[PDB]
Amino acid sequence: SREEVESLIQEVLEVYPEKARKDRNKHLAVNCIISNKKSQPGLMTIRGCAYAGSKGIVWGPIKDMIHISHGPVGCGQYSRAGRRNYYIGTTGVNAFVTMNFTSDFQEKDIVFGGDKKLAKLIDEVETLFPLNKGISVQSECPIGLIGDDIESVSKVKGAELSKTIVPVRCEGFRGVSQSLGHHIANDAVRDWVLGKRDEDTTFASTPYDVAIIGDYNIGGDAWSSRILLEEMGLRCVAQWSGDGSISEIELTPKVKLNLVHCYRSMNYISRHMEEKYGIPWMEYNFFGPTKTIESLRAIAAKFDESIQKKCEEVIAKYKPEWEAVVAKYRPRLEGKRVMLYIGGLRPRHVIGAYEDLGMEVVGTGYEFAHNDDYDRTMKEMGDSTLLYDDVTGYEFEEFVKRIKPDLIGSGIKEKFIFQKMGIPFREMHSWDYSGPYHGFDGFAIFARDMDMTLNNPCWKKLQAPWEA
Amino acid sequence: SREEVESLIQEVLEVYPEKARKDRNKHLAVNCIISNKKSQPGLMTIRGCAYAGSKGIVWGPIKDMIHISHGPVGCGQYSRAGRRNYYIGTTGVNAFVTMNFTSDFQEKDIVFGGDKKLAKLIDEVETLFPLNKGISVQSECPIGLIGDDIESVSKVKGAELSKTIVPVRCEGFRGVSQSLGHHIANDAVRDWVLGKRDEDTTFASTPYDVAIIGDYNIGGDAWSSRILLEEMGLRCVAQWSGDGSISEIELTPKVKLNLVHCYRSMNYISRHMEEKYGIPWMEYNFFGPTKTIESLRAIAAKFDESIQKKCEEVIAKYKPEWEAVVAKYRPRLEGKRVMLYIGGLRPRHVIGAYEDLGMEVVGTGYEFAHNDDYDRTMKEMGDSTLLYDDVTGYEFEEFVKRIKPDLIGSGIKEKFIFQKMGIPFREMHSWDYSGPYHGFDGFAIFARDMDMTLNNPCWKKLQAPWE
Amino acid sequence: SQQVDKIKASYPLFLDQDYKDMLAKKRDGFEEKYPQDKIDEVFQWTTTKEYQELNFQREALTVNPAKACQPLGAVLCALGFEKTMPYVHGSQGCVAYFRSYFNRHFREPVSCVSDSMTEDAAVFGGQQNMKDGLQNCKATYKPDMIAVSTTCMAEVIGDDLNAFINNSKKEGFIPDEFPVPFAHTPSFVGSHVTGWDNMFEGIARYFTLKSMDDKVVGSNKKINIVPGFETYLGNFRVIKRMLSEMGVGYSLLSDPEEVLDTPADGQFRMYAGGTTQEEMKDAPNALNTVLLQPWHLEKTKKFVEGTWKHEVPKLNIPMGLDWTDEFLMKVSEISGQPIPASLTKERGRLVDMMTDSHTWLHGKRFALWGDPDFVMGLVKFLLELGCEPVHILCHNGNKRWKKAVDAILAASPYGKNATVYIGKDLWHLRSLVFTDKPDFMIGNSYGKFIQRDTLHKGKEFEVPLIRIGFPIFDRHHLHRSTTLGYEGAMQILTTLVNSILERLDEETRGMQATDYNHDLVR
Amino acid sequence: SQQVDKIKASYPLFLDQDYKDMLAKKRDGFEEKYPQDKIDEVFQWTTTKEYQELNFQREALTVNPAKACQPLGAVLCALGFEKTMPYVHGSQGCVAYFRSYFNRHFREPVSCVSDSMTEDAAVFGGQQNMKDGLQNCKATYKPDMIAVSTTCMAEVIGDDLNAFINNSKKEGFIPDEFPVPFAHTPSFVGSHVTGWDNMFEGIARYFTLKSMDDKVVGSNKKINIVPGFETYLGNFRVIKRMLSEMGVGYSLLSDPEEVLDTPADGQFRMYAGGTTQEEMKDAPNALNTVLLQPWHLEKTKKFVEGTWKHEVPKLNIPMGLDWTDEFLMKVSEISGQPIPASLTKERGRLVDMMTDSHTWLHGKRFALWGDPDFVMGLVKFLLELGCEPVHILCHNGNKRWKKAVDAILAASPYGKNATVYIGKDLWHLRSLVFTDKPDFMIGNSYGKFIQRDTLHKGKEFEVPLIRIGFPIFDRHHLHRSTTLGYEGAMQILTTLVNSILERLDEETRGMQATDYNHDLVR
């Protein structure tokens, strides 16, 4: 009930002091909501920083470049191989994604500056890792605070070594969340990488050239997407960022259409490429069969008769496969109610996949989404369902206590709380070390995963038989 | 010593009742002793049975044959892969050594008999293990008591299937130890296997043909020996029975000289082959450089100048290897005192290898040796050392408590007792899952094994610093 | 040859070229070996459905059994009593094997005697052996009690143990008040677990049968606990710990945990701890008696119910979540003690582990074997974990037991693809893991030869062994582990999930091939 | 594609031909990838002694560090106190990472807050963040105490935590008598263990500095125990277990074992157990204070000695045989309690295990890493087992510590081939295990990438990882384990030997090739 959910909201906010209460009330709603604002101090946010957004999300996945966590040891270590942005390569020789390169700032670096050290560590990178095809330097909190000039070093060392060196001022005090990092990361690609092959005319184009923008290949997601597009007759010139090479990014301006999956993280560079190079972009969704089919047809419509025929041939190929998945799994999950809390895309994008298994998303929310994301979410969510932006640990626990969902889909910091409460939980960031979840092949895994957890025998055993 | 030793012996014997005291007295001596007599009840002998001797020791290693533990489920299970008689093969297909085949006697078999069951199981073996080159049936305790005739079944089924089926009456109640099992098993080979190619002259013999008799290839021991003999110019036609095939055994009567390592377990068939086939046999010893060198020269002497020269070339080749072993390890083991208790050969045979590392054997003994083994042991042991035949668990602990050796070399039933007493222990049956110990390559392993245990840091830490 | 700085043991020594050539020449010259092509052909055939059909038609031949013989259990049972010598009336070869078998599993001394019955006793009996045997053992090893069992020789010749012991006392070979409980333990009846049952009932009878008029049920306010054939030290220890936490008075009848785990401190101790004679005499005064492993303690149940007049609760082995709960709640009912906060907490930490690990455990397929009670407990817990026990094998199982397990399987969607086998051995199981390949085996060390066989067919067909049960010979100190209670369940869970993850890591360790899935975080 | 009845996850899904062909097409078309031959060439070069010389010449670049940052340790220290909320003053990204790091290791909730300082606070300070942060946290999560640390942002801009907290109390945001201990924990100084020390000392100061007048040393007759940065639940558990066994009155100061192991029973417990405020206030009345990990507890030592006037005993971390004896004997002296028979026996069972397994352990060569105290304890125990700690790496170790470990290596023939490395990381260690190949690695999960590299050079060059330390992310529930005391020594003994035996079994599993050495009994 709308009235019930609204009274849930007042009640929860009664614990806060006035300052926090008035603010949080604006970030909670029933579909009217604000977002992309500062987090209230001391309320146990789930949010990361601009560094997590630039290094962890946008740049880190780029496999043939070396990414320097510039600053003290913490950030680079805690983010080391945390996100499963999958790639093919030989780690340590020509690929570098799972490694942690860092300037490991000590007090002398804080006091004197780390600019000479960065210059030296670039020489050391070049000596020990010759097959690297570029460097990025990801600023941690102290870099800007101590007045370092990482741009000059990149300019100088880059010119000296004839190598692409990318300064990213993604310090963790910047912005309010991971979201500003995306923008900074997008702008860094634009300024230092994307225009390298503007004068280059040697690339043999076709009418069906395409780029996957904002798919980070979590558990192989991007590969499960790529395969369908290329079966439809398209040529994926680039994947930004999952299993991405630098040369693919540089080739992207040559494509005919940018296929945007993650809007929040990659809409900035998508705008630029339309403005500068005229390349149109379109949002799509490859979560579940309904959205995948809808998406494949929308994409194919931007091309010609031949691609649209191939579109129908792909859809007909996979029809028996996904229908077999639903016949098996929909009866196991039908009517079950889901609550979600994730970053900037998946709180709305995975809703159709749930509905394809007969499940209802009764609550959803974002860590760092903008109003344009919430606009997009209004349409996808049901009437009278709960919305929460930058939810607090306290709120999220309280909402679940009352709503009593059958399943919760969030991150690692949420997982073990709700498991103790006796509610099945699925990690919707890391896919709980499973996936892919994209495409038709992903839906099969998704369905199997939601069922294994939601219907697991362990959940009927929380109460001791003498505790009743 | 001396003298202290006889005082030790009489003190230890005083715990027994008189029947056992009078008997055990006869089996303890200072280097005079009887052996191969029945065990006194309830004294915790370390001895096994005739089945252990026949199946566990002699027949079991034969790799391309299937050996049936005929009787109830125990004997076959406890003896499955317990002894490390090494072989090369594809187990379950053409080799079967580590497997346990059994008639798994139930009470219906005890009452009615197991002969109809044996026949059916032979058929089942043929269907499921086609590549087997022969079968042996190893009798367990009840087979003879029950009045079964495995011989008739073997003759009939063997003739039906054109297969070698060897009945072995090695029931555990027979004899007094593993020893009679050897004898029974030797006669089993003689009667049912060894004479098959008597008529067959197709095998092209050479003057340098030889057979390694009584090496069971424990941890590769036989392979470590074969390599030296063949480098010396000889051709080892057969290995009895470590890594042994049935054809190798059938070829043995074509050889020129039988090289006997384990006298106790294989002297019977060796004497038979001298009688029937005129093949001379000689004992040798491949434990340590001194004994291996001695043996190579004794063996080469039976042939001609060309083998004798190749002998000296083999010796010349390995000289720097074993000399480097002693240089490294003798100083770490020099003066250390060893007590031994093993079966029928190694209590005397390994003494030379110990002495090559400057170690003293202050006591030794056999589970199941005969008087002719003790005759051979007398020489190898120093004056006033302790001899014990079929030693009791009680005696052995008491002897060690008084004598206080630096190292004990015995079996698995002894191992953990003496480790708790704080004395370094090495398994001298299984080689503590290490080895080989035979030959020049074996000595290196032997030496580093004795050192690693005797000088291990754990032995300094038995007592807590607060008691 | 050897380098003195890097000595080679058998492996890899014999992989040297000179040894490899030597072995090749031995084979070619004298072994008359079947061609490798023929060996490969026969091996591939042994992996098939056709061979399996033949394999399962076997009536007479047993291959690689998953059981031992009665007197083994009787010895282990006897080892659990204070200062008592297990004594096996019969031939001595048996005792050599029993000791060695346990030596190898526990890596401890295992004291046991024989009366060395020989050829001639077959005609005239083992009477004199008993007389001299008892007197010799009593004097030499100085036990407070001697627990007598039998080998098959002695059973076949029909030696009356009762009379033989009575006469030994009559003739003055041992004092008449010296405890000499006995049991007939024929190797050709049942298995090692049956010898445990037989020995225990025999010892129960000895201290109680002719003293019952004195007894009143519940008068000592304790609960008797009979462990059964038990080769994990932690299982004895977990049961005592849990009962102590509850403040329940108890008597663990047959407790070998001290003797099978003496400290290495400069002295050998033949005897340590154990159930006292007086604990056994006073057992009828217990409130009740709980059989931890009821499917091989039938005879004992009949005696405790028939003579002691105890109402032995119908309880499954306390393995996994449900049966540990039921065990504790039954113990609370009998004793009148509540289940404490500590056990409630520990239960929830097990459940918490189950919730953290369920995604890797879900749908995993297991072939497993062992003793009846152990297998069903494992089967139960596997189902509680969302795992599928596809091949369930108990060589020494019976029809009534199989029904029980089939019912347990039927009450769960995870038992849908499960089949229970009784009377079948590890060579049967070998076929099953080829034709209906599981992801893992749970079993004892003999299972390593099945994994070796599967790998030879191909890495994709290899079925890794998870070592739980008896005997474990090729790993060290796993006998210290626990399989009962919440503690044991937590240990099984951890072993199972990490075995899965270790195998996943192996399969994904291929540089630029499969290492895309080589996750730091799982 | 997918077969509905056998769904493939990422692995082995992407081994399917159409995916394989797709990924070849992606590479050839658009990646501009170095030829495989060139990739092989560079990889092979990365394994050489030439590369290692360049690798070790690094002074600016750090690759695959074996350490974390200060506020990590401050949080873990803070969690060990009763109903305490760790609170990191600074930027919020840090706290997301701290919680996630521990989440993944412990598989538990990890409650910790931030006051979310942003760009505008850099120019003008985080005073308002503190006022509102402290007020919000107290009201929302209802802690009894808030323990404040800092991120590098807050440290660089130079926020006075003391004044900020005082101004918060002065202006009514939190009550004046609400406990708010603090510590400056700069991530560019030392490592995570340094933050633990700083946080602890800050809490020790808070509760005792101003109250020293009425305190008599030894009046409460207890011994204080400070565990240091500790990620194994069993280690907290074993220390308490051993002290209770001795009848030693004690106070474990910072005990997170309850919060890091709550039961899954239908409710989330944010706070659980922990060291009470009353225990910290009373701590100076103890007989003495024992530092379980003295090499990262320097500051705490100086305060305890300087203010409390406890003569902190010079004791190594209680790891392995000798240092556990020393720990127990020192505790005995201070407390006047005798070391009970139970602990004497346990020591002997450890020694028994060492004698059983010594032949497989002897001479085995290890590369290892971790924190200073953990590493020297492991090194010490390895020497006691007759193992050779060839490569000893401690990224967050110091000159004085290295001296102490070199001395320990000197006191044993098994330390002759050992080298201790401070300031080096796991990319350095990668080189060492190629050029001076050991048998195994003992370390945390980041080591899995080193094993992967070694395997790529070849199976004979593969150096398997033995997971002991922090963080362990790719195995489940190893955080429940024990590394301290006899119990911990026993667990390590068992892991080490069985790691060796599993490796032998793999190497000897080849049918007709190496399985001659595939022993059932080892």
Ligand code: CLF
């Ligand atoms: S002395 Fe020997 S090992 Fe013993 S039977 Fe006997 S032949 Fe054998 Fe077998 S199953 Fe057991 S151990 Fe026997 S009581 Fe029978």
Ligand code: CLF
């Ligand atoms: S919000 Fe972010 S993750 Fe934090 S520093 Fe900061 S840029 Fe980084 Fe780094 S080392 Fe730590 S976690 Fe920091 S306090 Fe520094």
Ligand SMILES: [Ca+2]
């Ligand atoms: Ca032991």
Ligand SMILES: [Ca+2]
């Ligand atoms: Ca948990």
